[PDB]
Amino acid sequence: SKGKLGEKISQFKIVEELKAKGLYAYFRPIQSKQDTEVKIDGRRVLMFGSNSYLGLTTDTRIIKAAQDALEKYGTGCAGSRFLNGTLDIHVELEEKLSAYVGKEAAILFSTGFQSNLGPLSCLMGRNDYILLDERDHASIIDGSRLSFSKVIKYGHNNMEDLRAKLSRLPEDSAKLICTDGIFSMEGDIVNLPELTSIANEFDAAVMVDDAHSLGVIGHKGAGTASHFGLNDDVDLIMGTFSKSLASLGGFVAGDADVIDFLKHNARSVMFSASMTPASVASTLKALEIIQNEPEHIEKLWKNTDYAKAQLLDHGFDLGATESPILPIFIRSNEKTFWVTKMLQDDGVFVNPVVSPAVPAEESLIRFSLMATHTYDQIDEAIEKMVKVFKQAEV
Amino acid sequence: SKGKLGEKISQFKIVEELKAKGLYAYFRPIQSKQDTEVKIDGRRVLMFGSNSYLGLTTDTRIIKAAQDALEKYGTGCAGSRFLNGTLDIHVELEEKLSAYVGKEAAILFSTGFQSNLGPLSCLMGRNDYILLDERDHASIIDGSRLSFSKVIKYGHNNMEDLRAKLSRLPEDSAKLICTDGIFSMEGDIVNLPELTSIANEFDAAVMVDDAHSLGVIGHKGAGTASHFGLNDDVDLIMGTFSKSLASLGGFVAGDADVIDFLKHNARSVMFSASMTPASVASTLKALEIIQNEPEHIEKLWKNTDYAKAQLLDHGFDLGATESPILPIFIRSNEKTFWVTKMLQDDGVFVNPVVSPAVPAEESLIRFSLMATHTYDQIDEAIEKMVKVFKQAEV
Ligand SMILES: Cc1ncc(COP(=O)(O)O)c(CN[C@@H](CO)C(=O)O)c1O
Ligand SMILES: Cc1ncc(COP(=O)(O)O)c(CN[C@@H](CO)C(=O)O)c1O
């Protein structure tokens, strides 16, 4: 019955207002492969809103690996990994990820999101604590809320705040710090050296979420711990397959006893169907390519360095990024929506960040690079972005 | 750092004990398609532990649809639906599901699990209530814990307990009842007529989780509301693609305003990458097949009716199932583990249910039918199950 439910949703007007004003640009229906250009409503649009940092969703080798796994294994495993849903190829990918990130063991999840839910819900319990960077990804916050622990946020990359908060806690309790590696909104990197120094002082476990780091930073893309040389000071390395690795799913890697505990105790792996064979095989093949072919990462960073320089040169105001995510400040929600739609209508796809996710005054568009972008494409997008910012009067 | 973390996991011994005793049968690595027989360690094993109720993960049409979507769209969409991760085929599948279950609108999630997290986390808030059947799926409990509401469990299919609990609540609050349609442990069906009668009395929203109902009950498999004729008294119909529909993902369908609210407010859709093209296309093609070819559902039920009769005839003690899930009581955890492994070693795959998920005295194995099972296969499995139950002295 719907009386009260109708009242709950009644105040949510922003989408109808966007649509009525002709500004709506969420759920844009793409008609083609995710690529440097996509087709929307039959037209070509430059894609600067993706997470496919290495451009690999179109790699024919990866497509063929996925198609071959469909031929061999079918369309789905129809059960949790725990029961009837494990394949030899899941175990192969676990072994290969473990080797890549330098850990004993790994457990796959059917999404990145569920990869965070798993360890955050089941390791810290009553009388324990989880310490979260305040800008951590929503899946981290949610995973932590599924624990029976006390969840404490600390100031973004604020090591004094982290230390202070840890200091106040009872000695006779377990603690686990979870942080994004690269934070996607502003594209900045966690201060992992200090964070791990503090963790070691207070015997706190460390978990890093490398969604946006894998295939981006670290040796041959192996992530944030790798980037800093701090493999031995990070207990759990979490990643996703939906970004550089061009697929769907994620994993948590760590010590075999911890991973064994997780795979038998995390609700998000015991009570959710396993990754499809196609996604296992595309992740396996992408992981090979990222390591074997250094040009992908190199070109991603050439593009990043070029675009960033070109944006700064044109007088855009960028956030403190250290990654291929280039946040461009606009500082007005209305303007952010207008710019986003005007760019769409002129063939450029960027992602808006607006209230209530951030304050109006920090609203921005996020311009992300892929290895497969050309300098010409970047130049066209920036040309158009200059014109639109003027039309919008930013 | 790992001192306290090591202590947290130190008491979890059951897996090492199972392994050391040669009883361990979780995460069994399958080497073939999910089918009525699977290959494990090079040997053939009858599969009676699956959720693929219609046997469709091996359907060449569905495989080819998935392979063709890989060719056209690549291996992944590399973003949330909200941003750059929507395809025309996602929208097509939403429209087709909406039509199938008789609702205005639907929103896809990349897993069934996340499909429950979405609406349960974001519709009821502070000062509201979610009422859950105590045997609801873990994803429902978790989704509800992600809300800012008060979560109340009621006794399993206990309409008096539901009514009483609703009665005590403030009038000036929203309420939402969420139930599994078919409950998978015992295979029983919710008392949706009474539940909806109560909901209507207290103006509570109703959400049904049809993971195990779609492709099983209802007209042409359209689920629990369909089975009872109660489409108009159920606000939200949730389903998964990982069972009958032979894929990965799920959906929530309902009124367009509610669905519009969800797709912009549920963290599990805004902050998680979209379904892979292959899984969209396999779900689309399976949904066509389920409707167009009535033989699948018919044969599933012929098998169910045959197996159930054959088990009862051999003196097995079954749970109160109304579905293709046949729970077979053993009532000893040790025996449940032994039986499970002995059957595995003799070429029969069943799923154990043990403490702490249930009391020792209600421990059981779950024997699930698929449309593609033959009577000969059922007979072989039951023959073997008689021998093992004797060897184990149940
Ligand atoms: C009633 C119900 N609701 C939701 C889900 C979650 O769906 P998913 O497995 O597609 O994520 C399941 C999963 N059920 C299986 C895994 O697919 C399990 O082993 O629990 C379910 O049974
Ligand atoms: C740091 C971090 N950790 C975890 C996840 C979840 O991974 P998933 O999208 O593969 O489920 C994301 C998702 N990030 C994207 C969707 O892929 C988003 O729009 O939020 C992430 O950025």
Author numbering:
A (entry chain A), B (entry chain A): 2 to 395
Please share text taken word for word from the publication where this structure appeared.
Bacterial SPTs from sphingolipid-containing bacteria such as Sphingomonas paucimobilis, which is rich in glycosphingolipids, and Sphingobacterium multivorum, which is rich in phosphosphingolipids, function as a water-soluble homodimer enzyme and are useful as a prototypical model system of human SPT. Based on these enzymological and structural analyses, the synthesis of KDS from d-serine was explained as the result of the slow racemization to l-serine, followed by the reaction with palmitoyl-CoA, and SPT would not catalyze the direct condensation between d-serine and palmitoyl-CoA.
To further study the substrate recognition mechanism and the mechanism of the KDS production from d-serine by SPT, we tried to prepare the crystal of SPT complexed with d-serine by a soaking experiment. This d-serine–soaked crystal diffracted to 1.65 Å resolution, and the diffraction data were indexed in the tetragonal space group P41212 with unit cell parameters, a = b = 61.0 Å, c = 207.3 Å, α = β = γ = 90°. Unexpectedly, a model of the PLP–l-serine external aldimine was well assigned at the occupancy of 1 to this electron density map. The amount of l-serine in the commercial d-serine sample was below the detection limit, but the possibility that the binding affinity of d-serine to SPT in crystal is so low that even a trace amount of contaminating l-serine yields the SPT–l-serine binary complex cannot be ruled out.
